[PDB]
Amino acid sequence: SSLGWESLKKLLVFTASGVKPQGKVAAFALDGTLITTRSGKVFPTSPSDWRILYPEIPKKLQELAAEGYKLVIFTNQMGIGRGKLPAEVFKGKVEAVLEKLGVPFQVLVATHAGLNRKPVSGMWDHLQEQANEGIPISVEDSVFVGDAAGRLANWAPGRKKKDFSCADRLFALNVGLPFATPEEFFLKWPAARFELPAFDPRTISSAGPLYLPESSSLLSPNPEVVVAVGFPGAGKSTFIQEHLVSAGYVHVNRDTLGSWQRCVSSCQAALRQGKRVVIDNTNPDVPSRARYIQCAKDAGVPCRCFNFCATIEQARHNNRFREMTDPSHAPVSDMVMFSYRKQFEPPTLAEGFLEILEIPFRLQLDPALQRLYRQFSEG
Ligand SMILES: [Mg+2]
């Protein structure tokens, strides 16, 4: 009898009869890799809407098992976490697929966004640390096979669409696994052309200066207004807390003050009191920023802009990292991200700023969290 299903926080694991721990793994995505629709539709019409993708598949799997590879599936199924796909039904579909494939598999299912969702390596770490009886797995001798491979359109007849995702290729990259597409692997087709995301989080450094120009000072001894600018999730608020509010700057958040009449009133009152003020908002465009410049000008104090360099990709990456690691994080919607980008006009001295400091996007974190930060986290 099979050890069967285990249900964890944001993970399902199935261990078939005959699964043995091994020092090397041949791992597979499920949908689009081992199976596709029987119906010939892009998306399955029922739980039973599947067939084995290529008849070459079972033979390769038998060869792999005979060579000592532990056969494993790593499948994203966020429809389960979203409530659109019942777990108990998906479990049944998997068991039927495994029956048809005719070999013992261990299956890991990422039901939610976060640490377990490919390309993040959570499922690999669960396999290694919890589900392989303490046997170290040689990543160099293993392989991951999947269809979310970032391929350009037309790698084969009837593939006018590029891959929906690069999550499978990126999962392999994060873990250090050799990677192949189903057609490369099962069919021995030549390598398909693919693209990787433009932002590579492995390139993120703690290095470099905190701000530029370095000859400048983050603080002023006299009243002033600092206007922060940068994507939400860029880490503006954390920076502003650490360096300005800790130094006694009055924190101004337009969102929470109600009107402008009140935001500018707050600013003006702080300035009369001999205080320095920081505007901690996205402030993407000239009109957003002009209200604070005018406030400063009226009070006769300098206005400076702190321009956070994070790109949209870096911001979204940071947002996903914080969602996975920080229980106080307010998740930023893609709606607000792309909205900001639409509105963004870079700050210039012409608007009326005394100076503009650039704040490079830099790695802030426990060593483990640093390893996690350098993982691609979206396909
Ligand atoms: Mg797939």
UniProtKB/Swiss-Prot annotation:
Record's subcellular location: Nucleus
One GO cellular component term noted in the UniProt record for this chain: SCF ubiquitin ligase complex
UniProt region (Phosphatase), positions on chain: 4-195
Keyword Lyase among UniProt keywords: no
Domain of life: Eukaryota
Assigned keywords, A-Z: Acetylation, ATP-binding, DNA damage, DNA repair, Hydrolase, Kinase, Multifunctional enzyme, Nucleotide-binding, Nucleus, Phosphoprotein, Transferase
Catalytic activity as recorded in UniProt: a 3'end (2'-deoxyribonucleotide 3'-phosphate)-DNA + H2O = a 3'-end 2'-deoxyribonucleotide-DNA + phosphate; a 5'-end dephospho-2'-deoxyribonucleoside-DNA + ATP = a 5'-end 5'-phospho-2'-deoxyribonucleoside-DNA + ADP + H(+)
Enzyme Commission number, as recorded: 3.1.3.32, 2.7.1.78
Residues noted as binding ATP in the record, renumbered to the chain: G230, F231, P232, G233, A234, G235, K236, S237
Single Gene Ontology BP annotation: double-strand break repair via nonhomologous end joining
Record function comment: Plays a key role in the repair of DNA damage, functioning as part of both the non-homologous end-joining (NHEJ) and base excision repair (BER) pathways. Through its two catalytic activities, PNK ensures that DNA termini are compatible with extension and ligation by either removing 3'-phosphates from, or by phosphorylating 5'-hydroxyl groups on, the ribose sugar of the DNA backbone.
Assigned protein family: In the N-terminal section; belongs to the DNA 3' phosphatase family.
Protein's UniProt name: Bifunctional polynucleotide phosphatase/kinase
Annotated source species: Mus musculus (Mouse)
Source species taxonomy: Eukaryota, Metazoa, Chordata, Craniata, Vertebrata
Parent-protein residues present: 142 to 522 of 522
